[PDB]
């Protein structure tokens, strides 16, 4: 139940600096007052990250998705190859109540949207859903930046998340914050592209890509990652 | 090597007397350390003591003589050396 979006809004694909974001806990082992070196997928320091002020973007290996959203406009995500019923598709929705994760052969139009009526009840993102594979429900995820990391390893979809209040106007803060592991989806899907959802009334977010490399991580007294060093960045590194 | 495993010990038993040879060298090393210290420091037969009144022609040795106040009975320089290095 959707039609083509006539008002083709254009989000300028600007470029900004990655700085030192994209650090997450790599394992499930506690440590304290130790400097540990680990090799894994990470966001390289001081790289370009794309800024949007809805197009189609490839999944590649892993995705760092950040949003300095206000009033919680962002709703969910769509994952798949061609976003049609012919191939398995995945949907994440975070509405006012419990979040829903769905894996079915869903069908979508050109520009799916959620929309709100001002009494808030509207959902026509998809068009058809015949064969379903996985269903899940969890606690809702939600001036305040929210960062997520999506990885697909060995038939496991890892989602790491972290939200922190922000006061800077536009650019990503030049601070440090690790990303705790949030959810593991134990379903194997061949994802290659993904989308985004907005809560329109009836647009700034940053996207970066990961690469495999080695990091050095310092644990404080209480076991919280507090500082990091990227190996292949500079002779001093 | 084994970490308290009987099977590992039995398998190692057929490798000959390697462990006696290994342990026989570290003991010699330790004895050598003890002998080194003893032969470098134990040079005199009696424990001499300085007189309580100290008038050495104007020279002042107060920084090198032991300090009775400190529990360690070490001099100032020795305390500095001990604190300087881990």
């Amino acid at each position: 139940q959707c039609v083509n979006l006539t008002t083709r809004t254009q989000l300028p694909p600007a470029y900004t600096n990655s700085f030192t974001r994209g650090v997450y806990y790599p394992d499930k082992v506690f440590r304290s007052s130790v400097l540990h070196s680990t090799q894994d997928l990470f966001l390289p320091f001081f790289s370009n990250v794309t800024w949007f002020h809805n197009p189609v973007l490839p999944f590649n290996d892993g995705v760092y998705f950040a949003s300095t959203e206000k009033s919680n406009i962002i709703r969910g995500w769509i994952f798949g190859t061609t976003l049609d019923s012919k191939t398995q598709s995945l949907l994440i929705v975070n509405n006012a109540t419990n979040v829903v994760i769905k894996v079915c052969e869903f069908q979508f139009c050109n520009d799916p949207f959620l929309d709100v009526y001002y009494m808030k009840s509207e959902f026509r993102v998809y068009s058809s859903a015949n064969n379903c594979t996985f269903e899940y429900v969890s606690q809702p995820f939600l001036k305040n930046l929210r960062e997520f990391v999506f990885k697909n390893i060995d038939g496991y979809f890892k989602i790491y998340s972290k939200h922190t209040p922000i006061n800077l106007v536009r650019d990503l803060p030049q601070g440090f914050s690790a990303l705790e592991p949030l959810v593991d989806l134990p379903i194997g899907i061949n994802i290659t592209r993904f989308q985004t959802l907005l809560a329109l009334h009836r647009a700034a977010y940053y996207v970066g890509y990961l690469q495999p490399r080695t990091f050095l991580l310092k644990y404080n007294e209480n076991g919280t990652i507090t500082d990091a060093v990227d190996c292949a960045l500079d002779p001093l590194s | 090597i084994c970490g308290d495993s009987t099977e590992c010990s039995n398998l190692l038993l057929q490798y000959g007397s390697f462990c006696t040879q290994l342990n026989r060298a570290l003991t010699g090393i330790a004895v050598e350390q003890d002998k080194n210290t003893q032969e470098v420091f134990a040079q005199v037969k009696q424990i001499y003591k300085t007189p309580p009144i100290k008038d050495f022609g104007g020279f002042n040795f107060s920084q090198i003589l032991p300090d009775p106040s400190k529990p360690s009975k070490r001099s100032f320089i020795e305390d500095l050396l001990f604190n300087k290095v881990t």
């Binding site: 499930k28 440590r31 134990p186 076991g223 | -």
Partner: protein, 366 residues
């Protein structure tokens, strides 16, 4: 012991190092989650229909209690062969994310399913990794999977551009260009369909009757345990040198209440040189602690068999709290180098005869 170690019947004055000392464990503790639901295995083993080899059925099982004893003793299986695990120990282990693959193959191809094995099914239908861990079960299905009218529904891959990949599924059906000219969707010269059918008939002899094969694959500690076997869970014991089997992690030591500040997602910490320090019990979710039981070398101080035959015993680096033939012996002395039994402490000070350590040494008088 000194005489045996020195390989002599006479021993001169001195101190010798004979053997070592360890504190034996006392009892056992087992701690498992409170999960008791059964595991579905007859659903997949007794399925009426199995898919073809190229479309082998893939199933994922987790969060269940599986008893392998009732399947180990079953005689309905012609072939029962595992690689990385001894079958009798499957009832004593816990895994996560058990994968089951079921298919139907010919009798003579059973050997093809093996790590580091080459052939036709092994490289064109189902490639097994060289380091694969798991088990394979095979059994003849000539009585039910063979039709007197002929079974052509079962097909196997015959041609491909190159070799497959381990644990890869291929369902693409395109004409194969066997020559130097495109087929253009015409199955003629140098043009064949990559799938070849079967002629399963009950009248056929051995080597052609249908065979049903199910393979199971496991993992080695990549997530908190979810699928174990039927086992009994004991309670927790404190301040005792005991051995534990915490969720498959087996180790011996003394368990102590620890104040380490975990975070709501870690299961067990460690410290420098990857030594397992603290753990979390599954049922109660408490921050425990692991410390090795006391151990250390022992030494004998003797004045020489030429003079006397009484000796003293020194336990190195051992606090005089857990000493236990010399359970009592004589008065016991405590030093910076350990504990000493069989000698009497005095207030005097003489020259050093038999160096002991920390500035103290012993001599014969007793």
């Amino acid at each position: 012991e000194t005489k045996c170690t020195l390989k002599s019947f006479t021993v001169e004055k001195g101190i010798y190092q004979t053997s070592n000392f360890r504190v034996q464990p006392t009892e056992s503790i087992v701690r498992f989650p409170n999960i008791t639901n059964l595991c579905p295995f007859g659903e997949v083993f007794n399925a009426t229909r199995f898919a073809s080899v190229y479309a082998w059925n893939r199933k994922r099982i987790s969060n269940c209690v599986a008893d392998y004893s009732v399947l180990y003793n079953s005689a309905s299986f012609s072939t029962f062969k595992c690689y990385g695990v001894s079958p009798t120990k499957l009832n004593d282990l816990c895994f996560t994310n058990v994968y089951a693959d079921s298919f139907v193959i010919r009798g003579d191809e059973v050997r093809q399913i093996a790590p580091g094995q080459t052939g036709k099914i092994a490289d064109y239908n189902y490639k097994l990794p060289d380091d694969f861990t798991g088990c394979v079960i095979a059994w003849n299905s000539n009585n039910l999977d063979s039709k007197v009218g002929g079974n052509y529904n079962y097909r196997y891959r015959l041609f491909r551009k190159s070799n497959l990949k381990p644990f890869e599924r291929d369902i693409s059906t395109e004409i194969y260009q066997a020559g130097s000219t495109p087929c253009n969707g015409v199955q003629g010269f140098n043009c064949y369909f990559p799938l070849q059918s079967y002629g399963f008939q009950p009248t056929n002899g051995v080597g052609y009757q249908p065979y049903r094969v199910v393979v199971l694959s496991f993992e080695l500690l990549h997530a908190p345990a979810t699928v174990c076997g039927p086992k009994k869970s004991t309670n927790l014991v404190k301040n005792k040198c005991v051995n534990f089997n915490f969720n498959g992690l087996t180790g011996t030591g003394v368990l102590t209440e620890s104040n380490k500040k975990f975070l709501p997602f870690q299961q067990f910490g460690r410290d420098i040189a990857d030594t397992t320090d603290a753990v979390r019990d599954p049922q109660t979710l408490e921050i425990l602690d692991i410390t090795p039981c006391s151990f250390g070398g022992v030494s004998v101080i003797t004045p020489g068999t030429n003079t006397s035959n009484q000796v003293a015993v020194l336990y190195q680096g051992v606090n005089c709290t857990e000493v236990p033939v010399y359970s009592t012996g004589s008065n016991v002395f405590q030093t910076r180098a350990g504990c000493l039994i069989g000698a009497e402490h005095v207030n005097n000070s003489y020259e050093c005869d038999i160096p002991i350590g920390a500035g103290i040494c012993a001599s014969y008088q007793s």
